[PDB]
Each structure stands twice: as C-alpha cells, then as structure tokens.
Amino acid sequence: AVQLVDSGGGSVQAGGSLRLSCAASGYTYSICTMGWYRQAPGEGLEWVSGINADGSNTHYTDSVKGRFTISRDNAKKTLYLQMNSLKPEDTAIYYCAAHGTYDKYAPCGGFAGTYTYWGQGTQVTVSSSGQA
Amino acid sequence: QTSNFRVQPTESIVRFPNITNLCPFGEVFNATRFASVYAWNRKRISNCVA
C-alpha cells in the first residue's frame, strides 16, 4: 500500500537549523500534491508547508514566515524541508501527506469515499538547554 | 383639611448604564482562521453585555 516514511527529527538548539525528509512510495509523484504538517502536543494539526505536484505553488504558512526550503526529488520521490532560526514554538511533531483524493459526498448521499495519504510523523524539539 | 382627589397623568422613564463592556463577538465571527471540525475551537463569554 501507499506509504510515507518520515525521518529527520531530533532535539536542536534554538537559533539553529535542521532538516527532515519524507520518503513516499506506492504512487507516482506527479499524481498527488504533497506537503507536511505540525502537531503541537496540546493543539490540533496545522499546515506548515506543501509542494505542488508539479511545483507550481509550493505554498507555505506564514506562522513559520520565511524560514523554509521545501524541495521534492522525483527520482527518489522524496520530499525535504529545513528549519532556520529555530525557536521553542517550533517544537512539535511534523507529519507528511499527499493530497489529490478527497471524499465526494452528495446531498444526503454517501460519506464513504477515497481519502488522502498520510505519513508517520517525526518529533522536533527546540530548546536553548543541552541534553545528557 | 381635604385629601388629594386630584388625578395627574404620569409618564414612565427607564435609565441604565451606557454599555461599558461589549461582548467580543467580533473576535469569534470576524476572525482570520478557525479550527477543524474535529478540533473545534471553543471560547467562553461571561461578564459582558451581549
């Protein structure tokens, strides 16, 4: 089945920069619009960055402002992104997913339908203190 | 000494403080983003004139 394995998480010092990746398999890269998310421990999922299937929009979220570089390689069908000027607020679990399949529910019709493809989710910690 | 027996019409008047604290319904309708249906946002309103 379709899979999206996430990796690249770890505790990093505030004001630094790291990077993480999502390896996608089971579908062609151009079929689906891909992107990531972020999950604060006590709040719901939010959208941070995303890449167009072809690369037209590659829109981002102003919450992280200009601190992004998303890049998808077609040969490996793998998505990458990085953080700059890390701050504690960025501490969260980031997931990977691909759009394209959205449920079609007619008026009082059938709610069961195709859905998008999600990933695994890797945790990223930003803090000015060291680690043991 | 004679009792009143003098009818006089009377008006009616009401008087209250102005408003002085409006419930912040602007914050819940004219906002920028709302939560997903699964993570519905909630706000409590109390101590204000709605």
Swiss-Prot record, chain B:
Residues 6-22 are annotated as: Disordered. Changing residue 26 to D: In strain: Omicron/BA.1, Omicron/BA.2, Omicron/BA.2.12.1, Omicron/BA.4, Omicron/BA.5, Omicron/BQ.1.1. It comes from the Viruses. Changing residue 33 to T: In strain: Omicron/BQ.1.1, Omicron/XBB.1.5, Omicron/EG.5.1. Changing residue 33 to K: In strain: Mu/B.1.621. Glycans are attached at residues 10, 12, 18, 30. Binds to host ACE2. RBD also interacts with the N-linked glycan on 'Asn-90' of ACE2. Cleavage of S generates a polybasic C-terminal sequence on S1 that binds to host Neuropilin-1 (NRP1) and Neuropilin-2 (NRP2) receptors. Interacts with host integrin alpha-5/beta-1 (ITGA5:ITGB1) and with ACE2 in complex with integrin alpha-5/beta-1 (ITGA5:ITGB1). May interact via cytoplasmic c-terminus with M protein. May interact (via N-terminus) with host bilirubin and biliverdin, thereby preventing antibody binding to the SARS-CoV-2 spike NTD via an allosteric mechanism. Attaches the virion to the cell membrane by interacting with host receptor, initiating the infection. The major receptor is host ACE2. When S2/S2' has been cleaved, binding to the receptor triggers direct fusion at the cell membrane. When S2/S2' has not been cleaved, binding to the receptor results in internalization of the virus by endocytosis using host TFRC and GRM2 and leading to fusion of the virion membrane with the host endosomal membrane. Alternatively, may use NRP1/NRP2 and integrin as entry receptors. This is Spike protein S1. The chain holds residues 314 to 363 of 1273 of the full protein.
